[PDB]
C-alpha cells in the first residue's frame, strides 16, 4: 500500500550490495545522533529476527568532523569483531554519560573498560585497511544520496527514513515490505 516517491524512493542507479545473494538492509547512522540512539530499541530486536536470506549492515555516515571520528571507531570495532558486544555501551557513553569519544586515545581508554584490546584498537584504527573502508563508506553514502540519519537502504535500491515512513515501527514494516519485493524478484 506504500507509494514509490512517498514513503520510499527507488535509486535510479542501484548500488552493489556487500553480500551478493542476500537481500541487503543498510542502516546509515552516527553514534552521536539522538534520533539514531532513540531508534535503537526498535531496530535492534527487529534486526535480530531477520531470516537467513537477509543481510543487515550498519554503515556509519561519514559526513565530516566528529561523524568521521565516530565512524572510524565503528569500523575499527567491526574489524576487531567486537562492535556487536559494545554497540549499546558506546551509545550509552555518548548520550547518557556525556563522553565525547573524540580522539583515539579517549576511545581506547573507554573501550578497554569494555574489554577491548587497547593496542589492537589503536593499531587497527590507524591502519590502511580502515582508511580504505572509510573511503568505501563515503562513496556508498554518496551513491545512496543520503543527507541525514538514520536512513535505511534496502538491497542498494530503496531509500527511506523515519520521517518518510511515518515513525520507527513504520520504518521497519516498510523495510519488511521492500525485502519481500526483492525476494519475489526474478534473478
Ligand atoms: C563497504 C564498506 C565500507 C565500510 C564499512 C562497511 C562496508 C560494507 S557495506 C557495503 N559494501 N557494499 C555495499 N554496501 N552496503
Numbering used by the authors: 5 to 191
Publication passage describing the model:
Enzymes that catalyze disulfide bond formation in the periplasm of many Gram-negative bacteria are essential for virulence. This family of disulfide oxidoreductases, in particular the primary oxidase DsbA and its partner membrane-protein DsbB, co-operate to catalyze the oxidative folding of disulfide bond containing proteins, many of which are secreted or cell-surface virulence factors. Deletion of P. aeruginosa dsbA1 (that encodes PaDsbA1) elicits numerous effects in phenotypic assays including: inability to process elastase to a mature form; inability to export the Type 3 Secretion System (T3SS), and toxins ExoU or ExoT; impaired ability to survive intracellularly in HeLa cells; loss of twitching motility; and reduced alkaline phosphatase and lipase activity. Consequently PaDsbA1 is a highly significant control point affecting the function of many downstream virulence effector molecules and as such is a potential target for inhibitor development. As with other DsbA enzymes, the catalytic surface of PaDsbA1 is composed of a CPHC active site, and three neighbouring surface loops that determine redox character as well as the nature of interactions with substrates and the partner protein DsbB.
For all crystallization experiments we used the E82I variant of PaDsbA1. Crystal soaking experiments yielded a 1.45 Å resolution co-crystal structure of PaDsbA1-E82I in complex with Fragment 1 with an Rfactor/Rfree of 13.6%/16.3% respectively. In both the X-ray structure and the HADDOCK models of the complex, Fragment 1 is positioned at an interface between the thioredoxin (TRX) and helical domains of PaDsbA1, on the non-catalytic face of the enzyme. Fragment 1 bound to PaDsbA1 at the end of this groove adjacent to helix H6. The amino-triazole ring of Fragment 1 binds into a pocket that is formed by residues Tyr148, Ser22 and Glu28, where it is sandwiched between the surface formed by helix H6, the B2 sheet and B1-B2 connecting loop The ortho-methylbenzene group is positioned close to the interface of H6 and H2 of the helical domain. In the crystal structure however, the majority of observable contacts between PaDsbA1 and Fragment 1 are to this amino-triazole group for which the electron density map is sharply resolved. Specifically Fragment 1 is coordinated by two side-chain mediated hydrogen bonds between the amino substituent of the triazole ring and residues Glu28 (2.99 Å) and Tyr148 (2.92 Å). Additional stabilization is provided by a π-stacking interaction between the triazole ring and amide bond of Val21 –Ser22 (3.55 Å from centroid to Ser22 Cα). Electron density for the ortho-methylbenzene group is less well defined in the X-ray structure presumably the result of a degree of flexibility. The crystal structure of PaDsbA1 undergoes very minor conformational changes upon fragment binding.
